[PDB]
Amino acid sequence: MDIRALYDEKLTTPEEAVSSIASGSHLSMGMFAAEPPALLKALADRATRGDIGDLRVYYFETAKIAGDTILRYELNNRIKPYSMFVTAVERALIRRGIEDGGRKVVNYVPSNFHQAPRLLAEEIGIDTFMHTVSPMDCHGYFSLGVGNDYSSRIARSARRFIVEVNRYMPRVQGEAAAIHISEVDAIVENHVPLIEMPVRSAIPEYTSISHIIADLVPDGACLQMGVGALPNLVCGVLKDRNDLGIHTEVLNPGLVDLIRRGVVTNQRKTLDRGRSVFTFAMGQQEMYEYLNDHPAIFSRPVDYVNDPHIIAQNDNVVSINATLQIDLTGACNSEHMLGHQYSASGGQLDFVRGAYASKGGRSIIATPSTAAKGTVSRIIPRIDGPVTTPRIDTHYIVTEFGAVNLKGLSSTERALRIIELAHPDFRDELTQAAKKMHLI
Amino acid sequence: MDIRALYDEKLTTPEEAVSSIASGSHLSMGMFAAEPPALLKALADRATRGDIGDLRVYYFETAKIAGDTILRYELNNRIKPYSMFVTAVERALIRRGIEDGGRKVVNYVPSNFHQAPRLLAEEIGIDTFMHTVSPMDCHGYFSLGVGNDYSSRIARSARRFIVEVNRYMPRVQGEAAAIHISEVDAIVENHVPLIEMPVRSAIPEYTSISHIIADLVPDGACLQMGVGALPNLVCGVLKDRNDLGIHTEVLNPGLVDLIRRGVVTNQRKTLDRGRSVFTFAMGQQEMYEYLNDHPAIFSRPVDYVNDPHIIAQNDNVVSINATLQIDLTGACNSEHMLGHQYSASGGQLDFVRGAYASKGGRSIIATPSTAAKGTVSRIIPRIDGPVTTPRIDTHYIVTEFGAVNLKGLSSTERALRIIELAHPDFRDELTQAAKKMHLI
């Protein structure tokens, strides 16, 4: 089996590589940084030329890469976004559509991220899959790098798999993370830095928040850190710990810093002992570079990583997630769009459930108590509509004013303890609302 | 070892049995038919005489026995309902309380039923547990009979366990279903028929619904279903099947009929092969008598039965649940009280999740399309507030007009297909609503 010959055989231009994708078919691509820019630019060009139509693209975790190519508003009639998370890119599209005669331009597909591999392969069906990969090694394998998720599965289930080789994509070890040249239909090469998450600055509230959380992290904790600035930054208060583990949905810079520092050994885990487990990674160049050939990091597919039964196997799980609002029932909301709920597709609830089921486990959902320079309360009477984390599932809630374990508390006990986590400026107003709702 | 000597030492009157329960303590009891009428009457009398106070009662599945005695409105100032399900009994109390100067008289404790054993025993803590049991056998064991649920844990974890022996309570085999006299603190005897779930008349829509559902059940299916005329009718249609299995939260007369007919054999199950598994039972005298000493019926605790990971290990699970409303997003609502959501505490979602995870599994949620002589649609634009089954979890929905599998469908595809399950009188209005909501 000659790999070098197979490679040359499949190597081609972005233009020719995407030239065969059928109108009326289903396409998917990797998450975030994995989105292949050369391939997506060439696909967008096809649409611009009017050479493809009715192409449904099903995907999670949008990046400017897709935002600026296939997803551009002008192509919305030809490349139809079947978005499975609604992010800043989709929010902008949706608002533009509303302005343009109330046009629906984003087709949200409700789902559980943890079920994405089966949903895409079996319910939806994907004909073409495209993903950035690390360069082929001397045994004929590419790596999915920062992506496993549903990507490992759809790379195989799709009729055609097209890869974009990028020397900047780290070579990552993981379950089905390695792709043999024989599993690939076409190859293009494009060496450019991976897209980064924005770096964010700490706010004063994070000191209290991080301090409160630290007191809640037991010896040998097995960490998951949710998306957002808060869990990424709170991670740093654990610099002084030892023998921590990682089993997380998203691998972020804060977690990788703990690995770098030797804080994370993974020696107290039941599953994947000795290796930090994640399903996809987002960060900056320093983090991406560090992942390359790292023998103590191991990606796994999302249907493993985000299975609460699997999460719970490891003792002393600590899940730290952020939210946008907490209401007086103890329900939480991470959705930016008022009156909508797309964020429930995320893996937050998987870890809320999984951490609580872990022996010695704790789920923490945290937020500053206010927004807009202290003028807006993030502790509210009642969330408008369907929630992200239901009140029956919430475990620990934290603001800069303290922590409350909600499990086993009555609705009266909950409302009273939650009001005390609000900023003093709002407690009277919240107490009256609770009275009106008959929560107390 | 001398069990008759132990029985005689522990045997007492209901009045004496409940006399040492502390004020300001936590009491729990069995579910439904499990509630002990003589003990509960004696406890209520104790409150009436002003001899106990600040007694919190934590419980699920209320029955007339509880409503008639301890839960009587007039005793609300001494015996505090910390209800974990809100049923007809609590709805009546809540409404009466609002009328009576807007008083809060029921204190809902949000939870997952599947976590009840741990929540009651650990976060909440139970000082006294009371449960009706079958007569002591020659080895010194009583059976919890109709109830396992969280009862088998709390009978052991409560600081005192008081039983009410009733020869009408069947001797049921199960995991931790049998409790030795050495584990019982006091005994009273009260032989009276168990309370029955009322038999309700079928509505016309159930004929079509039971056939659509039955068409979705293959031979070898492993069934879970609720109580009522509809499930009874479904079981009626299923009388022609073979080698069905049972793994259900509640065991009902319909399922027991299939056992009696030899339709249910449990030979195709992966877990508990050969035995019908349930966590509590509700029905009529004929069904209760049938459970007595049945070697092929096996109760198990709710943290096993309602664990989606456990449910999913059996192939071809079919979960059949009812709902009150379905909205155009595919979310379902089972809560009777407008604007509120107490029904999410029930096990419906456990089985929605577990059935989908099962190999060949299907979760079905069914409702007639209208209410009130066809004047009100049960298919609605949008549920008012938090839901029972989230749109991200719904699998199959059914009305008298057919069935839809929602998995993998966009918001537009869902709305369009769901409207076709609504009564013709409402389809135009629902389509308009869908457009306004920007679903389509």
Numbering used by the authors:
A (entry chain B), B (entry chain A): 1 to 440
What does the paper behind this entry write?
Thus, ripA and ripB along with a third gene ripC, constitute a novel virulence operon designated rip (required for intracellular proliferation), thought to be important in intracellular replication of Y. pestis in macrophages. Further, CoA transferase activity assays suggest that RipA has a preference for butyryl or propionyl moieties compared to 4-hydroxybutyryl.
Although a network of ordered dimer-dimer interface waters facilitates tetramer formation in both RipA and YdiF, the increased buried surface and direct residue contacts found in RipA likely results in a more stable tetramer. With the exception of Glu61, which is protonated and polar, the pocket is entirely apolar, resembling those described in C. aminobutyricum 4-HBCoAT and SCOT with Phe85, Phe60 and Phe113 conserved in all 4-HBCoATs. The pocket size, which restricts the size of the acyl group that can bind effectively, appears to be large enough to accommodate acyl groups of three to four carbon atoms and helps explain the competition and DSF assays.
